[PDB]
Every structure is written in structure tokens, then in C-alpha cells.
TrEMBL record, chains A, B:
Coiled coil: none
Highest taxon of the lineage: Bacteria
Protein name (database record): Carrier domain-containing protein
Annotated residues for binding of S-adenosyl-L-homocysteine 3: 335, 359, 384-386
Organism placement in taxonomy: Bacteria, Bacillati, Cyanobacteriota, Cyanophyceae, Coleofasciculales
């Protein structure tokens, strides 16, 4: 029923579609291995379809045989028994090859296929390969987190000292050894209903900085809370503002928003003042837009998101059926900050592409058309990712690229949101996300003030006590919702440590 | 057989000797609670000995009763059943007190005593309280790790790029996707026997930086190893030296030692050149001594070690039997860097104290007397902590303070070393340690070159693949070896996160 034969260079297109165990695929590298050792690499075919393939190498002065790569085609039905059959063939065929003594390390491959864990295995695509190269060679590849995230770190350290003083101004945490239950602080602080969960997240900020001990049933103030808070808000905030504005000017927006929030936090938390009157002063959306451009980490993720979608569009422009334009949709495009850098990128291909600038709020789609009315190929629509496509007049499975920049977490059930995102794309379409992926303090002070931050009803798939997902949780939920080829991206210095990354661009593909 | 009664201020001396569940004891605070509510605090006595005590508070507009502290005397035999009896008394006595509705949260105290975990519970002493205050108010309390450890971080980042190039110069890791087993690199790199385990630790450095994937059976080079290494050692090291020397001049010694090592690392690792000829150039011990003074983190830990021992000496000078002098011993005093700041501190009390400057090597005791011959009260002796006291002419249980600054890990079995340390002290004597407590890269490059780093035979009580112990492992082994009142100290900003601290002063007491 199936055939084992030598790989050839003619098999390279199909080998590039495989999941790989040791490293991402690489067209020019498969070429060189097949040119240098044309009878060292076996594949297994079943009805013309490629199922599994094994590349070997000879090592240790030519006496032991090693596996250099194990490729599998996971969408073939019984592939695990077939890949086991190819493994056992290679062992037999390898020990009797001229000169070999031993086959090195087959048990790891046997275990990998029988207990299959899709996230261990690399997958590849032109897109994956081009983004890794870009990250590897980026100007920021030489710097480390302490340099790159310094502004965020120092803002968050100061803001936490302010936040403890805000609690002390509302009557709690002046002394070490106070004992509360969380429900009792909600009452004693008179937190309005909408912000009771935000209070949990704010307590959690102080917990991670050693100010409070939060346990199953009780919040307990520790010794460090006697000395940690700011002592004079007005003069110390003024002094920090001067220091921070001059030293990290590109982060001025973050400092301004956090300043405007904390200054009025007791009244905001008690429900006595609205946040749109305090921080969204007089429809000053420009302040809020600058949170996400202008500084080198934010521009790095924007460049990563935008180049990825640009590359994917050119990949699909290389296809001869033509006909329908390539349709891109951006969910929650907002003030169109990252959108603007992408439209400039795609603008060369304006006649084959169709770009939908969308947001749940009519306010932001009209903001968008005010900024992009010169682009004939950008269309505007209100769209809510949590609401039915039909009711919103959108054909399912009609988009090639869906873009969502830090919006998808502001929903009730992340599995329903990604299903709906899946419904947007046709098979092979590309999901492109930019997400904060740690429960970062900086985001709570203002982002936690908005209602979308607290819709979530599936905490089992979120971090700590907020609405964010980590890289692993995103990988889990994206696979659960019918995406594969998931590519999580962080700063270059943490590509090996993304489970702790604050921010991440994630691409994924509908299968 | 036992009596439950109200605490009084006359019980405060004995209450200070208890383990506490919520926070460290505090003499002036017990005073104020007993003055304000003289009938709110119960204790349990058994044959005049204090066993357990409970301080309560009324909360929530005077309707619920809470436990403010639970004190226990763990050296009393059946104390856990006695403390349960006092808990159950307090519940009965509390619900019928005038005005109270409910007793808040007794189940946590019940669980704490029946499943006793000594390291949860605070313990106290004059020493503990004074060091917490010092840390809390220290000039460094306002800074965070990224500021304080910047020099170490940047040195370690550069040194790792150099180390990968050192491997590439010895023939491995030029390409992504190479597969080795650890035994096979030992052979292929021709590592001399003494440094085979150091090779493991060096591979581990690159593992944590994403250069290599180290698994049960194999070392696998990743993509990042194509671009990470220095490209021209001579010019890039020169450029870094200039940058680093001018920016962190107080760390010049660390950069010099790492430079001298890595420059000759292949020959050092192959056994072709000795490390004392390369880094200990011509008996230049001053270079090596400056590793541990001169910069603000190192001086902070020295100040913490020295003030702690100074305080403990003055505590014991407040005792009227007098007679024998207070005898201090420093294990592995080395070049006496921290010793010099301590002798200046103790020099006021020179006539009641007797200080033993000791080291395993006669070279370092003579170095010591060259530096401290002006102090009549300092005695010199070669001493090996791993060797028998009797054979070395030292009375057991004769010392009041034993000091060991980053030496105790350089031994074969940490439990035998702490037992021997225990044998030095009389009951109530003080162990004072300064230890690196993460498997830090910086220390491997040169410290890993010395044989004492590799004596250890109990990896189950060490970190990763070196000889260090973390804070929790130190707490475990110190308790296993007969010490209590264990006080782990780190930088002020991490007193709540010491399981990740790079360096720690630890005091402990012989019971
Ligand atoms: N359920 C939902 N469906 C579609 N858009 C949503 C949404 N919930 C919130 N949004 C929109 O997403 C944004 C929240 S985060 C804004 C990020 C945006 N990319 C920007 O650059 O501004 C808001 O503008 C909001 O209008
Ligand atoms: N088993 C042992 N017993 C006593 N001293 C030891 C020892 N092993 C090593 N030493 C000594 O401890 C030192 C190793 S670390 C040196 C730290 C020392 N406090 C200083 O400031 O220099 C060396 O000087 C060595 O001579």
C-alpha cells in the first residue's frame, strides 16, 4: 500500500510542507544534502502523498549514523504508524551500510511520534523563515531586556509606589500586619461594582512587589509597605515627570496617561468620575495613539506585524488563477497607528488588495477614514468580532488576512473569539496578532479602567487575574480553534524565552 | 497539667523566643497591644514554660474577632497538640465575648500547626530585627535589579558571545543543527579530565541564552548560534574593554579576570596551560581581592555581613557572667577583604573578643597577618572545614561566631561541611555566610577553573550543574544540620523574591 524510496530534489516542495523535529525546513539546505549524499535520505509515500521523511548524516570519522532531520506530514491519516515504519526501515537499512557501526539515538524519535505534541515540532513556510532572519539580524539583536525595557520597568516601579499611596489615601495599608479579605476591601474602599475585579489586579501588582501577601482567603500587608509608598505625591511625581520625560522622551505618552489616571484614582475607583473625562480629555485621541508608536520596542513589533503581512500578500500575489482581490481585514483598528505603517507597505500592490479598516466603534472607523481617505482601496465598516458575521453583513471565509492588534483579549470567551476569527478566513488565510503576553502592571492603570478588559469569563485560559494570554496559552487556544503554523515572535534576545515575554507578534494559519 | 491565662507585659521576653505565623516579633509592639487590650491575648503555659500564645484584634466596626498573631514555642515537646488546645479555647472564649459575631479565619492556623513547615514561620531575635531595618532603609532600597546588577549583566552578555566563539575556535558550533553527546565533545575538544564537568557548566551557559538546546542525551546547536559569537575577538574585546572600564570602573577587576581567562580558554581547557600562570599573574593577589569590594552591591553585602556580626558581638557583651573572651573564627578568610572591614568594626571591643583569621592555605593566613599584624587580638591558623577538628588542633563547640564568605560551597558534601561548622560553635553560636545563590555565569569563567568548585558529590543539594546552593537549598541544609533562626538576606528590592537572588548574606544559629 505504501512505498519507501530515496528523497530527490523533486521532493523538496513537498518536504517544505512537513512538520520537523530538529529545526525549521530550508529549501537551499535540503538541496545541498540531496546533492552531497543522494542515497542517504529516505521518504515514505502513500498514494503519491508524502507522509514521512528522514535525513541522515555520518559522524565520528564515518562510523556512526545519525538522524539529521525527521519530517512528518501530520494531516495524513495514519501517519504515526507510517512514520514508525520508516524509522524501523532506516534502522535496518542504516546498520548494514558500508562502514557504519551504530545508529545514534533513535529512541527520541520513536517517543516523539507515539506521544505526539504538536508544539514541540517546528513547522515552516516562507513567512516563518523570513521573520526569523529579520529578527536574527535586527539592529536590536545585540541588546538585552534591561536596556530595551528600561522605560517600562522604571515607570512601573514608580507607579507601584504611587499606587500603594493611593490605597493609603483610601484608608488601607498604612501599617504592616493588617489583615483583610478581598470582599471586605471592596466594601471598605467603596469600589464601584465595575472595578471590583480591577481591584484584584491592583492588589496583585503590590503582591508581586512584596508589599502584600495575597493568599487563598486573605490580603496581608508586609513590612515593606511601611516605607514603599510615595510620601508627597505632588512633588515626587513632578520630580519623576521631569526625570522621565527628559530621559525617555519617546515614552512620554505612557507617563502622561498613568499620571492622569493615578492622580484621580480614588474617584475613578469609587465610580465618582468617568475615565473618559479624565484621560480621554476632550477627545484627545492623539495622546492615546502615541502609546503604541514612537519608541523602538513598539516600532519593532509594528515592523514585524507589518512586514509579515506584506510578505504574505506578495506570496499570494505569485499565484496565477488571479481573479478576486486579496482581502485584508483589521479588527479593532482603533486610531490606525500600526495600520498606517502597513497601508504604506501594501500601497504598492493597491490594485490586487482590498483592505477593510474596521472597529467596533463608529468613532474609530470615522477616525480611520479621516486618516486614510486618500487610499481608494481601504473600506470602512463597524465590526464586532464577538458578534455574528451574518448579522453584520460579512461573508464568512472570504478574507485572506485578518489583523488584530491588542484587541482579541478584550472579549468574553477567547475560544469563541478565535472561532469567529477562523470564520473570517478562507482555508490557508493568515491570522496576524500583536498581543501583550505577560500580566504587565503598566497596562492595568488605564487599560484596566475600560470595560472590555473585564468581559472575560474563561479565566482558566488567562494569566493571573487579568484578560491577557501568555505565548503558551495562545498556542493552546489557536490550535484548539483550527489554526496551525503558529509563529510566536518576541524581541530577538528572548526568542528562546517567550513564555516570559511581555509582548509578542503571533502569526497563525487556518487549516 | 497546663494553664491558659492572659498574656502580660512580663511575658514579653518569652514571647520574643517564639516562632510567629504572621510577621516577626517586635518588643515595643507587644507592649502596645498588651497596654491597649489587656484581656484580648491568651497564652498557654506548661510547667512555667511558655508554649503557645494568641493575640486577637476586633475588626469591622467591632463585630468580628481576628487573630493578630499566633506564637508557638517549637522546642516544647508536644507543642502541636497544646497549640491546638489553645486555638480551640480561643474560639470558645471569643464567640461569647461582648459584641462579637464571628471569629475570622481559624482554619488557616489549624492547618499551619498540624502540617508544620518550619520555613513558613518567622522567627526573631534582636539580630533579625536590626538587619531588616537596615535593609529597609538602605540607600539602595530605592533602586531595582536592572540598575544594581547592570555591570554583571552586561559583562555576562558579552562573555557569553566570547565563549561561543571560543567553542567555534575549538571546532564546534559554527553551524545550526549540529548534534553532539556530551561525552563526545569532551573527546572532540580534548578537554582535560579536570575540566570535563566545567565543560558541562559552560554548555549550560549557552543553553540558557538560546544558543544550544541541551536535552537528556544530546547537545543541539540552534539558529541563534550562527550570529551570536564575536566575529573578531581582538578588536571587539578591546572595544568592549574601553566601554566597560569607563562606564563601570568599580567592576574593572571582574572584566580583567574574565578577559585573561577567555583569551587563553582553549589552552586552559585542554590542560596545556595552568590557570595560576594566566590569571594569578606573578602572585598578583590584589587583582583577585578587588573582585569582592569596591562596588556598591559587594560593599552592601559586606556591610550586611559585618554589621550582623558586630551586632551579635555587642549582644553577647551585654551578659554578666563574663570570663572567657568571645571567640570569632573566619573560615577561608582568603585575602581578608571583608575581614578588614569587620576587624575595623570589632576593633572597639578588642579586649573581650578573640578573632581567628583562618584559611586552608598557609599562603592566605600569612597574607592575612601581613595585613592585620597591628591587631594584637587576631590569631592565625590553617584550617580546613572538611577536615577533623581534633587533627587540626581546634576545640569543638568553642566559638561564638563562625564566618564563611563564599567558601562553604567549595566542598565535597554540603551536609558534612555544615555539620563540621556546627561542631565549631557552642549552642547559640552564630553562623554568618556570604554566598552566591544562583548558578551565575560570571563565576564560572574563573571560579570554575579552580578544583574546589568541583569537589561536590551531592548534586541533589546543588543548583543546575555547579556547586552553588540557592536560598531554599541553604535553608533546607542548614535546618538538616542543626541550625534554626535562619535569616536569608538579599538586596532590598528582592527580599520577597530571594529564591532568584544572585547573592545572599545568611545568618543562622546553633540550637
Ligand atoms: N469586540 C470588539 N470587536 C471589534 N473591535 C473591538 C472590540 N472591542 C474593542 N474593539 C476596538 O479595539 C480597540 C481596543 S485596543 C485598540 C488597539 C488598536 N489597534 C489601536 O491602534 O488603537 C478600540 O478602538 C475598540 O474600539
Ligand atoms: N575546605 C576549605 N577549608 C577552609 N578554607 C578553604 C577551603 N577551601 C578553600 N578555602 C579557602 O577559601 C578561599 C576560597 S573563596 C575565597 C573567599 C575569601 N573570603 C576571600 O575574601 O578571599 C581560598 O582562599 C581558599 O584558600
Amino acid at each position: 500500500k505504501y512505498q519507501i524510496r530515496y528523497a530527490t530534489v523533486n521532493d523538496i516542495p513537498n518536504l517544505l510542507k512537513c512538520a520537523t523535529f530538529n529545526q525549521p525546513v530550508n529549501e537551499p539546505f535540503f538541496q545541498v544534502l540531496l546533492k552531497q549524499t543522494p542515497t542517504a535520505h529516505l521518504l515514505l509515500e502513500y498514494q503519491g502523498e508524502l507522509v514521512a521523511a528522514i535525513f541522515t548524516e555520518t559522524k565520528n570519522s564515518n562510523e556512526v549514523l545519525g538522524i539529521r532531520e525527521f519530517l512528518v506530514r501530520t494531516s495524513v491519516e495514519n501517519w504515526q504508524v507510517l512514520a514508525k515504519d520508516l524509522l524501523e526501515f532506516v534502522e535496518q537499512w542504516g546498520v548494514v551500510k558500508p562502514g557504519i557501526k551504530e545508529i545514534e539515538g533513535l529512541l527520541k524519535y520513536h517517543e516523539a511520534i507515539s506521544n505526539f505534541q504538536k508544539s514541540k515540532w517546528y513547522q515552516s513556510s516562507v513567512l516563518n523563515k523570513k521573520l526569523i532572519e529579520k529578527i536574527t539580524l535586527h539592529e536590536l539583536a545585540t541588546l538585552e531586556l534591561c536596556n530595551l525595557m528600561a522605560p517600562e520597568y522604571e515607570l512601573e516601579a514608580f507607579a507601584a509606589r504611587w499606587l500603594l499611596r493611593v490605597f493609603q489615601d483610601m484608608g488601607v495599608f498604612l501599617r504592616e500586619g493588617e489583615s483583610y479579605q478581598e470582599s471586605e476591601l471592596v466594601s471598605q474602599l467603596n469600589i464601584s461594582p465595575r472595578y471590583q475585579r480591577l481591584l484584584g489586579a491592583l492588589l496583585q501588582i503590590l503582591h508581586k512587589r512584596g508589599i502584600l501577601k495575597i493568599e487563598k482567603d486573605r490580603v496581608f500587608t508586609l513590612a515593606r509597605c511601611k516605607t514603599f509608598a510615595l510620601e508627597n505625591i505632588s512633588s515626587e511625581v513632578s520630580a519623576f515627570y521631569d526625570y522621565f520625560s527628559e530621559k525617555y522622551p519617546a515614552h512620554l505618552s505612557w507617563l502622561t496617561v498613568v499620571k492622569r489616571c493615578l492622580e484621580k484614582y480614588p474617584l475613578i475607583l469609587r465610580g465618582e468620575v468617568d475615565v473618559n473625562e479624565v484621560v480621554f480629555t476632550d477627545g484627545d485621541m492623539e495622546l492615546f495613539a502615541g502609546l503604541f508608536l514612537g519608541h523602538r520596542v513598539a516600532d519593532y513589533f509594528n515592523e514585524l506585524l507589518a512586514d509579515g503581512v506584506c510578505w504574505e500578500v506578495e506570496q499570494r500575489l505569485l499565484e496565477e488563477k488571479r481573479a478576486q482581490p486579496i482581502r485584508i481585514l483589521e479588527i479593532g483598528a482603533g486610531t490606525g497607528g500600526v495600520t498606517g505603517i502597513l497601508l504604506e507597505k501594501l500601497a504598492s500592490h493597491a490594485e490586487q488588495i482590498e483592505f477593510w479598516f474596521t472597529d467596533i466603534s463608529s468613532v474609530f472607523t470615522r477616525y480611520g477614514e479621516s486618516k486614510f481617505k486618500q487610499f481608494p482601496w481601504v473600506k470602512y465598516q463597524t465590526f464586532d468580532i464577538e458578534k455574528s458575521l451574518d448579522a453584520q453583513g460579512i461573508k464568512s471565509e472570504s478574507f485572506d488576512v485578518v489583523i488584530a492588534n491588542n484587541v482579541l483579549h478584550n472579549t468574553k470567551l477567547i475560544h469563541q473569539t478565535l472561532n469567529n476569527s477562523n470564520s473570517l478566513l478562507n482555508t490557508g488565510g493568515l491570522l496576524a496578532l500583536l498581543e501583550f503576553t505577560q500580566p504587565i502592571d503598566i497596562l492595568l492603570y488605564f487599560g484596566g479602567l475600560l470595560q472590555g478588559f473585564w468581559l472575560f469569563e474563561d479565566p482558566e485560559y488567562r494569566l493571573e487575574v487579568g484578560c491577557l494570554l501568555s505565548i503558551p496559552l495562545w498556542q493552546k487556544v489557536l490550535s484548539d480553534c483550527g489554526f496551525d503554523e503558529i509563529i510566536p515572535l518576541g524581541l530577538p534576545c528572548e526568542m528562546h524565552a517567550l513564555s516570559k515575554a511581555r509582548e509578542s507578534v503571533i502569526f497563525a494559519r487556518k487549516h
